[PDB]
Design a protein around this ligand. Structure first.
Ligand SMILES: CCC(CC)Nc1cc(C)nc(Oc2c(C)cc(C)cc2C)c1C
Ligand SMILES: CCCCCCCC/C=C\CCCCCCCC(=O)O
Ligand SMILES: CCCCCCCC/C=C\CCCCCCCC(=O)O
Length: 421
C-alpha cells in the first residue's frame, strides 16, 4: 500500500543524487585546475563543494547498508555511518557559513571607512595629535585652539548631540564621510592631482584619497612621476615607484596596502588582512566534530536506538547538532539582510566593479536559499489533508534534497562568472 510511494521515490531520490555528484565533481575538478585557487574565494568554494561531495557519497553508503535488521542491531560500524552522515551535514552549513561570512564582509566590511579605520586607526575619545591639536574619530581635526572645552563645543555642533569628549563608531563614520568630500574637493581644485584622480576608479580613488589623508595635497603633488604612470594606466610601474618613496620607508605596512590597492584596483589587500583560510578550515571541518562528539554521548544515554538513525519519542538528541546548524543559518540570515540594508540604502547610487559583483552575489544567495531551505522548512509541518498533497509533499521532497548538489554546483560555478564579467 504505502510502500508503493516509497519504492517510486527511492528511484527519484537515487537518480538525482547521481546527477548531483557528477555535477559537483566536475565543478570540483574545475576549481583545483585553475590558478584561481590561490585566492581565498575559491578555497571556500572548493572546500564547500568537497563537503557536499563527501555527504552525497555517504548517501550511497547509507543506502547500500540500511535495513531494519541491521538497524535493530546497533552494530559498531552502523552507528559510525550515521555519525559520519550527520557530521557532513553540520559541515554543509558551516562551510556555507564560510561563504556567508566571506560574502558579508566583502560587501559590508570592505569600504573606504574600513580601509582607513585600519591604516590611520580610530579613536573614540578626544585626543591630541603629533602637532598638539585636538583630533577625534579617524584623524578628524576639530580645532586649533589649545582649549579642550572649545573642542567639545565643535564636536557637539558637528555631531549634534552632547558628546562629553566621546562619540560612537557610528558618528565617526559621518565625520569621516564629511572629511572625504573635503579631501575630494581639494584634489579636484589642484592641478597636479586632479587629472590623475579623474583618470582612476573607485578603489584607486580611495587609494589616492588615502594618501591625501596621510600627507595632504602638497605632499602628494610632489612625486609627479608616480602619478604620471597612474594617469597612463601603467599600474605595475606605479607600484614600483611608490616603493622607493620615503613614505614607504617611514611606514611600510600602510604603503603596501595602499600601493597594492593601486596595483590590483581591488580591496584584496585590505579584505584579506583579517580573513584567512585556516580560520575557515577550523570552522568548516574542525567545529562539526566536537558537535558530533557531544551528540554521540546524547545518543548513548537517552536514545541508543537503531544506529542512532532511529527516532524515539519523546526524548530528542538530534538537537545537539541541528541546534548549531540552525544557529549558523540564523547568523547568516542576519548577515544577508545586513548586506541588503547596505545595498539598498547606502549603495543604491553607486555602480562600480565591486557593486555589480555585489548585487549579483546576493541575487544568487536569494535564489539558492529557497531551493536548499524548503526541504528543512517542510520538515516541521505535515499534511494535514493527507490526500494527494501528502504524495506531493513527499514527492516534492526527493527532487529537492536530491538535486542540492546540482544547485550548489552551479551556484559556486556562478560565482566564477560573478567575480568579473
Ligand atoms: C537553508 C538550508 C541550508 C542547507 C545547506 N542552506 C543554507 C545555509 C546557510 C547557512 N546559508 C545559506 O545561504 C546564505 C545566506 C542566507 C546568507 C549569506 C550571507 C550567505 C549564504 C550562502 C543557505 C542557502
Ligand atoms: C582546531 C584549531 C587548530 C589549532 C592549531 C594551531 C593554529 C593556530 C591558530 C591560531 C594562532 C593564534 C594567533 C594567530 C593570530 C593571527 C591572526 C591572523 O593572522 O589573521
Ligand atoms: C572522510 C574524512 C573527512 C574529510 C575531512 C577533510 C578535511 C580537509 C582538511 C583540510 C583541507 C585543506 C584545503 C584548503 C586549502 C589550503 C588552505 C590553507 O592555506 O591552509
Amino acid at each position: 500500500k504505502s510502500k508503493v510511494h516509497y519504492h517510486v521515490a527511492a528511484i527519484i531520490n537515487y537518480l538525482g543524487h547521481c546527477i548531483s555528484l557528477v555535477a559537483l565533481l566536475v565543478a570540483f575538478v574545475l576549481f583545483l585546475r585553475a590558478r584561481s585557487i590561490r585566492c581565498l574565494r575559491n578555497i571556500i568554494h572548493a572546500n564547500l563543494i568537497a563537503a557536499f561531495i563527501l555527504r552525497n557519497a555517504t548517501w550511497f553508503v547509507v543506502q547500500l547498508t540500511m535495513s531494519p535488521e541491521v538497524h535493530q542491531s546497533n552494530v559498531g560500524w552502523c552507528r559510525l555511518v550515521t555519525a559520519a552522515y550527520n557530521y557532513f551535514h553540520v559541515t554543509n552549513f558551516f562551510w556555507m557559513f564560510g561563504e556567508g561570512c566571506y560574502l558579508h564582509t566583502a560587501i559590508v566590511l570592505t569600504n573606504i571607512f574600513e580601509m582607513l579605520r585600519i591604516d590611520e586607526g580610530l579613536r573614540l575619545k578626544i585626543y591630541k595629535d603629533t602637532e598638539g591639536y585636538y583630533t577625534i574619530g579617524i584623524g578628524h581635526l576639530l580645532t586649533k585652539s589649545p582649549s579642550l572645552s572649545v573642542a567639545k563645543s565643535e564636536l557637539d555642533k558637528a555631531i549634534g548631540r552632547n558628546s562629553n569628549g566621546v562619540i560612537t563608531k557610528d558618528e565617526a563614520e559621518k565625520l569621516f564621510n564629511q572629511d572625504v568630500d573635503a579631501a575630494v574637493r581639494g584634489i579636484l581644485r589642484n592641478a597636479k592631482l586632479k587629472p590623475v584622480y579623474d583618470s582612476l576608479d573607485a578603489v584607486r580613488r580611495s587609494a589616492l584619497i588615502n594618501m591625501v589623508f596621510q600627507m595632504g595635497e602638497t605632499g602628494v603633488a610632489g612625486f609627479t612621476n608616480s602619478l604620471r604612470m597612474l594617469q597612463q594606466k601603467r599600474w605595475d610601474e606605479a607600484a614600483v615607484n611608490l616603493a622607493k618613496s620615503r613614505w614607504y620607508n617611514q611606514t611600510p605596512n600602510r604603503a603596501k596596502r595602499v600601493i597594492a590597492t593601486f596595483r590590483t584596483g581591488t580591496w584584496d589587500a585590505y579584505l584579506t588582512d583579517r580573513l584567512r583560510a585556516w580560520m575557515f578550515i577550523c570552522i568548516g571541518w574542525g567545529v562539526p566534530f566536537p558537535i558530533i562528539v557531544a551528540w554521540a554521548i546524547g545518543k548513548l544515554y537517552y536514545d541508543n536506538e537503531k544506529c542512532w538513525a532511529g527516532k524515539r519519542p519523546g526524548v530528542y538528541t538530534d538537537y545537539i547538532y541541528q541546534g548549531p546548524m540552525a544557529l549558523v543559518l540564523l547568523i547568516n540570515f542576519i548577515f544577508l539582510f545586513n548586506i541588503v540594508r547596505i545595498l539598498m540604502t547606502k549603495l543604491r547610487a553607486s555602480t562600480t566593479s565591486e557593486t555589480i559583483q555585489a548585487r549579483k552575489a546576493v541575487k544568487a544567495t536569494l535564489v539558492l536559499l529557497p531551493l536548499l531551505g524548503i526541504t528543512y522548512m517542510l520538515a516541521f509541518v505535515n499534511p494535514g489533508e493527507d490526500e494527494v498533497s501528502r504524495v506531493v509533499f513527499i514527492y516534492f521532497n526527493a527532487f529537492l534534497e536530491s538535486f542540492q548538489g546540482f544547485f550548489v554546483s552551479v551556484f559556486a560555478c556562478f560565482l566564477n562568472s560573478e567575480v568579473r564579467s
